[PDB]
Amino acid sequence: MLNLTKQMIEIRTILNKVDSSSAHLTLPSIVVIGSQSSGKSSVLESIVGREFLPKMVTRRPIELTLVNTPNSNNVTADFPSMRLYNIKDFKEVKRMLMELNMEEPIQLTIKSSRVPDLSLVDLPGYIQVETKIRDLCEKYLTAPNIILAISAADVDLANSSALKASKAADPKGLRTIGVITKLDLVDPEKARSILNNKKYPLSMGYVGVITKTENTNGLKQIVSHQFEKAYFKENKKYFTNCQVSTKKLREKLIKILEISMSNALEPTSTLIQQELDDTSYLFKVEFNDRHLTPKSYLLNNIDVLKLGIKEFQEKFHRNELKSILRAELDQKVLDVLATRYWKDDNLQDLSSSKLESDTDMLYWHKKLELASSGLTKMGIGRLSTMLTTNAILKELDNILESTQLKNHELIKDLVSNTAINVLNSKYYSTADQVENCIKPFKYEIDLEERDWSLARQHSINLIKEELRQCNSRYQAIKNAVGSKKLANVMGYLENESNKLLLERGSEAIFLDKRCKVLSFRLKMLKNKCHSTIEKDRCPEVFLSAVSDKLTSTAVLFLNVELLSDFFYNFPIELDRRLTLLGDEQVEMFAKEDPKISRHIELQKRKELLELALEKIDSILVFKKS
Amino acid sequence: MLNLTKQMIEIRTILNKVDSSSAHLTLPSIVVIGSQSSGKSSVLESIVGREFLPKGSRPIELTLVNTPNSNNVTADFPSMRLYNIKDFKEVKRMLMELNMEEPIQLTIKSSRVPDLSLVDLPGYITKIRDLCEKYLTAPNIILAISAADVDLANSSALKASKAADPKGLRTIGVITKLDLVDPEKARSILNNKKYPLSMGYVGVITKTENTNGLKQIVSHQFEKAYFKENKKYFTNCQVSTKKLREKLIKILEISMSNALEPTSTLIQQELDDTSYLFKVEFNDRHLTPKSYLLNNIDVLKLGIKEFQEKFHRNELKSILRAELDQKVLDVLATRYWKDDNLQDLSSSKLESDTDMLYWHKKLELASSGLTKMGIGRLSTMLTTNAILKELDNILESTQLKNHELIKDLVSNTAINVLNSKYYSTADQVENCIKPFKYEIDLEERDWSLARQHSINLIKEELRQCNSRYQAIKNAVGSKKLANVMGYLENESKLLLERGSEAIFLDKRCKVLSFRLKMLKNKCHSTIEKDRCPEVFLSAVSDKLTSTAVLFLNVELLSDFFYNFPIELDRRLTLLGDEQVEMFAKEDPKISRHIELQKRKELLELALEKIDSILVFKKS
Amino acid sequence: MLNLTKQMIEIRTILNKVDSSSAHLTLPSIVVIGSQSSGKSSVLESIVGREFLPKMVTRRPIELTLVNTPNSNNVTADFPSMRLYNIKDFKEVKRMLMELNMEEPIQLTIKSSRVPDLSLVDLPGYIQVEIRDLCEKYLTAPNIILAISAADVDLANSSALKASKAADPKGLRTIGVITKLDLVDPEKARSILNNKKYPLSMGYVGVITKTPSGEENTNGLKQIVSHQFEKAYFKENKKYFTNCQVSTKKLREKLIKILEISMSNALEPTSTLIQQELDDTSYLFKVEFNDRHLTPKSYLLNNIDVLKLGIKEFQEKFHRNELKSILRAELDQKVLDVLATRYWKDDNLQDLSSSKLESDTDMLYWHKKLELASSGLTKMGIGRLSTMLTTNAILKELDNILESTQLKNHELIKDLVSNTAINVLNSKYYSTADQVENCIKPFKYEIDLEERDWSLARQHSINLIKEELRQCNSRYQAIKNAVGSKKLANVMGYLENKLLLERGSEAIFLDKRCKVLSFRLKMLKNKCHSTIEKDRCPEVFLSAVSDKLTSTAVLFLNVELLSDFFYNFPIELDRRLTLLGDEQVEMFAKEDPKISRHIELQKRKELLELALEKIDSILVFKKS
């Protein structure tokens, strides 16, 4: 013979933590139901020995855990699902429960030397026949749970909603104890009649109580009992074969809960071992019994990414940076040529032999200057810098996608933001110094034959491709409209011959006109622009030559100020940013991937179920002795 | 040629301090009534020298005090303390925030200020009616304010003075806005044929921090020589704020000294009565609240010391065993009296195993049922209540029987002291109890002793049962309910319930009777006749108690009786001056005591003052 | 050559500080307009590179100044039109713009090494034209119009392009910008840009400022992301966008280029406007204030000195007996009223002409008649009278000195001075008041009066009647000015037993006093000559006795109140003036309208000179 309800309540509360399980339901609890004003709060406060229950309607279920604490002469409260502990003032507790109703069971624990080791549930706002109410009656009123029906006595037992719902939840009254309140408001003759009832008979009988009337609130319950005890000692003979007073209920609940919880110990062990055996298989199959620490997972996957960036570092600083850059400046040259040269009516004049010393010989010399300045004073500093920045940021996205981090968005953003944070710190340093080192190209260059030659081959290839893009777009209209139907629209808009159709036709004219321009220029580049300082009024070659000088000088200052510094500092910064993440964030970050969430959640269950079972089995082995 | 107004005002002030007296009302005060939005505020603010009325950003009991070397102008609110308001902006707020028959007692102190007492009744006059009688009818001087722009022949503020004083002495007239009206019509206003007053009439004008003291000097300079520039247009007249003030000063001097003779009379009349009441009801015995509280607490402290002696011993042992007696009965009902085989326990010799086993098992469950019941907790709480109960008895026997606030402080500090030791006592008791949780020992000395107890315990139980049983016979019928009893045995309102109770009481009395016979003759030998539950349970109850009562005195009692006086004393010192008066005034006779002696002291102070002034004023 | 937009926008901001000019008007700014939900706030935020516009109702326009601050990677915002500078948190910028909408333009400036040098005016949403009193004003003068139009909407139905023709027929100062190019076919997009209904010289720009998918706004990420997608679409659809201007990059490039051309061309006419505006303001300054500068603080102090001068010049002269006379005026009026309050209403006043009395009771009745009269003037309460008289004398005279100075138009200063003066005088109130009643102790009786004092006494008492009963009778002449019937001796009788019945009672009182003073006049002149022997004329015994107290009264008025005032008043004033803040002094000075004009005119000249030095210099360089 030994009382282990303290331990059994720990098991129930442990099992209450396993996500969606009928395991905790197998361990009974004393559920309290009673009409509003039937004295239900009064009988509860009597068990606790203090006031804390506020008396609006539908206060919402209160999962009350009474825990006996040695060396604690005072009464304390704890709302764990809010990390609130050792509340010595019960007025605060009373208003906390009021603040909460402004179905979710309030997790509140009471700890004191006076209090017995119990588990109770305060079911509030009743039903007098006339959905959410249906849910609580299934969740709390069923299972092995003991029902405490609070009857007021100054009410007929057929009229009480408490006993009516009790028979509905039962009947036969095997797991129902009926408490009869306001025993003082009825003659001891009828009081004994109500208790020894025969309409609503219960296995765990009836208890008759009187509960009316620390120092201000402790003495309150002492005064209340003095009166209750008085009435019962005086009317002793009137209450033959009767269970009466607060003391006898505390006594009853203690006896019944021990019987109830321990009888449910073998059923719960079977059910736990059952869920524990299913959950072990799932672990060994989906995740091959591998333990997963979230902060570890997080850090190890960052090491992989940090490795990926070292691999990118290896194959980038090179002519690859020249390529990304020159490709952008190639497009600027093409724009400089269209906005200046290509639209000019006398563009054919450059292909001619004769020249007029003053007016026309200087016209092209001036044109070539503001075309060159247009490109050199364009903004190479910001361009180069903001170009190579996107390049890194983009390759980072590729590295992130080629790793397990492809499933974690919150991590991916951390990496991306911290990457741009690193890059930004050197934006000005890079951009400004790049502009300063590209100034010698802003006003003519003393280029060698070698420089001029390389530029010429590139310019030919540039215009080759530019012309091939225009012809294809011209042929695109030629086929989509009709070879002949095209000439109809073109000649009409031109007015040399005769809505949606005219748009295609007008475009086709521009393209027809462009190709002619690019053709007489491409042909010239191949047949004429051979000399350096002499053939200088060959824009395509000169512009490409200055852009070659601009690119090779920019890529060197991009490395020194931006590239090198990023590769060193980014890992160091990334690590710093990770250590800033609290345990909470890290779990959420890792739980993004549903496979990893599934992983985290399954082991949390396994460990909790293992904890419950160990406690149960050690108790069972002892109980079998 | 002395102006003892400062003292006469002082006398009026302290006579207003007495709970219920018409002595202060005898002493005159310049009551002011004026036309609403005319300039009722402006006229008063001029007398003082600063702005304060909430009419610009209920009745104000204004008390002007002349103070030496106080070049600055300060304000007091004796009812709200503060006592020094330099900046008059917060005074303006104070009169507006307080305005959200009650007199606002405001005091103004400065060297510019003359010695005067005034009352500011708002605008024109169940509430309005009382203000008209309370301050105007009495021997208090009246002042009327209006506006020159509105009808001058029709003045409600002057009409109210005519209604309260038709063709009377104590009245002073005031006319404002003299800049808007010509000096001709204003000449007929002062020496009027319509409303003549023996005190006189005066004409003035009030238009347009010390920026507020400059504002009064601007408005005074505004029309200083205006009364000079047209001397004939105002000859045989009382003109300017300077002479108005001089008038209020000299009239009050006489008015207050006129009323000084009947007041000294009425004071003595109301003092001889109060000194008679003190002589008859209290016998001139003085009452200091703090002293009364401490002296009565000392009496209570002694009552606890006297009880400490008459407690513990067997007196504590008796209460504990009586509660254990009830548990033995409850254990016996739950494990014996509701069992058919109860006779088998005596009648014949038990079987070789099964029958001996069952009855030996039953006393083990019953013993554990008693020992593992929760004695520690039970014991502690029994004695805890015992102290609180006796504490109330000591309280009701004393002078504190009328003082609930104290009774609660006492009952609270006691439970706090007892609570301090609850765990240590209960736990200690549960330890000394454990060696009795599974032990079949003792001797015939305590067995024969517990046997005799078991007889008497079953006896009084049978008595109470028979009584209740035979009492239902009277309520229904000896042969009437007897037939109704048999009606429930074959089928196996009030009468069906009373019958079902009687069926139980019948067999129970027969159950206790056969058990009583057993205990008498059969139960005798110690450990041999062990299966005599009522005896074994009485033996264990006598041990449980004896051991418990020892640690109840060790842990709980000794510490209570030592520490409780110390903490009670500590808690009383934590009471404020306001608390002490409230705690003591709870008894109506004690409230009467203080109320009377407060009036007595104040009336003696007024008289000693008023008398000495009369000795001077006659010479 | 160089791009002096940064310097040109600095000039435009100065020209926005001159309270009455069309100077800033002649310098270009990019006025942005577009229908609600067309990407107007989205295009501005792409240039800025940070989210800053609130998304509340969009009330008053935003004067958006963009400063390219070197070494500042971090994008910071400042609200110059309030004391709020380098704001790092753009949430607070968003909510400040929102708070400022709870019709002047909102002065907001963005600083960064990323942000270009640009002037922009964010005009309210919808731009329907219908009301648009802001649009008419801002879309005119030399200003570039940026017409934000969404591609998903027909160009003919665009609110921005409509107003652009309504303000600029022929697109000579309008840049068309077509947003939402991602909600339109690239062939149709090229169609919108290569328009013919609304063709513009400045061009059309196709943009995509779509956010594709929380420190994302702290850095330039959200923005980088939005551009990366935009750059993708125009690289993929490069083939379709032939002879088109596409991307935010090209728009930012265009805005920078165009603004330079615009601002530099508009520079030359603006200098001509500033030069005239300065010449006009310099002229007024020469002709109104002979080109003399004004320092509000210096001005006030200098005028205070002139005021402090008057008090010193008033101190030396006004002491002697000039105050003693003002005290004699308000003390002889009490010798006048000692009789009226007592001695006058006596019927036995006549029998003293006979000079026959009884040694037992007749010689006792007239002795205590003068003991009550001698105490009715010595216990009168002159302390408060003399002190507050002199206090008010000093106070009135101070206002005179203030009108005598330029301080006549500044009331706040006039208050400050008078407040200080009364405070200084207050600190000596009781001290003086008590000293006037302390020195009057043996003078409360009559032993102090001699034969020599009686000389001026008998004569100044007949001279008392002289001036007073002539000026008081001059006002008795003021009644016969208005009118006439009267009748006229009969009114007095039927009263003795409407309007004129009131003067009948006035006349009956005057008749009594006119005879009562006269039989005294004919007697006291040739009756009482002796000092100790003759003691029955109160008029001669009190008119000089009050003035014998008056002589002893001005002495202690000087000792306590007067000496201290003249000493401590400049000291306390100088102290009280230091307390005044630079904001308070400007407000105190700006009380006079001529001074408030002076301050404004020289401030305008200063700003105008500042701006011109900058314009003229830029022009010299540009003309080379």
Ligand SMILES: Nc1nc2c(ncn2[C@@H]2O[C@H](COP(=O)(O)OP(=O)(O)O)[C@@H](O)[C@H]2O)c(=O)[nH]1
């Ligand atoms: N007379 C009497 N009143 C009681 C008793 N028990 C509870 N009450 C009163 O019943 C009233 C309302 O019930 P309450 O205690 O709030 O419990 P509820 O049923 O949760 O509302 C309170 O005012 C209690 O004092 C009792 O046993 N006797």
Ligand SMILES: Nc1nc2c(ncn2[C@@H]2O[C@H](COP(=O)(O)OP(=O)(O)O)[C@@H](O)[C@H]2O)c(=O)[nH]1
């Ligand atoms: N011109 C002039 N206005 C006065 C005079 N007396 C009072 N007032 C005006 O009366 C108005 C309101 O009266 P107030 O002084 O607030 O006293 P209230 O009657 O308590 O409201 C103010 O605007 C005053 O300026 C006066 O003698 N001359």
Ligand SMILES: Nc1nc2c(ncn2[C@@H]2O[C@H](COP(=O)(O)OP(=O)(O)O)[C@@H](O)[C@H]2O)c(=O)[nH]1
């Ligand atoms: N698809 C697409 N949406 C855009 C584009 N530009 C802006 N938006 C969206 O257009 C909506 C309203 O535009 P907003 O910038 O507020 O224009 P405003 O109302 O004229 O200031 C916003 O929800 C933007 O996300 C774009 O270029 N493409």
